Amino acid sequence: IKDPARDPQYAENEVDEMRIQKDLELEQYKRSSSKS
Amino acid sequence: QCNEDNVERDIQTEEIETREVWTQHPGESTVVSGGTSDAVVMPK
Pick from B23, B16, B41: nearest CA to A24: B41
Measured CA to CA, the distance from residue B44 to residue B42 in angstroms comes to 5
What is the secondary structure of B4-40 as a DSSP string? ---------------------SSS-SS--------TT
Q: Is B42 on the interface with A (CB under 8 A)?
A: yes
Q: Go through chain A and tell me how many residues it has.
A: 36
The amino acid present at A7, given as its one-letter code, is D
In this complex, is the C-beta atom of B44 within 8 Å of any C-beta atom belonging to chain A?
no
Distance CA B26, CA B32 (A): 11
Gap between the Cα atoms of B40 and B7, Å rounded: 63
Structural biology method used: cryo-EM
Query: A25–B39: do the CB atoms touch at under 8 Å?
Result: no
Nearest to A27 by CA among B8, B15, B33, B41: B41
Give resolution, Å, one decimal. Answer: 3.9
CA angle, residues A19, A25, A29, in degrees to nearest 5? 145
What element of type H or E holds A25? Answer: helix A13-31
Whole-number Å distance between alpha carbons of B21 and B18: 10
Q: Shortest CA distance to A31 belongs to which of B16, B41, B26? A: B41
Q: How many residues does chain B have?
A: 44
**B39: which chain A residues are within 8 Å (Cβ-Cβ)?**
28, 31-32
Contact A31 B42 (CB under 8 A): no
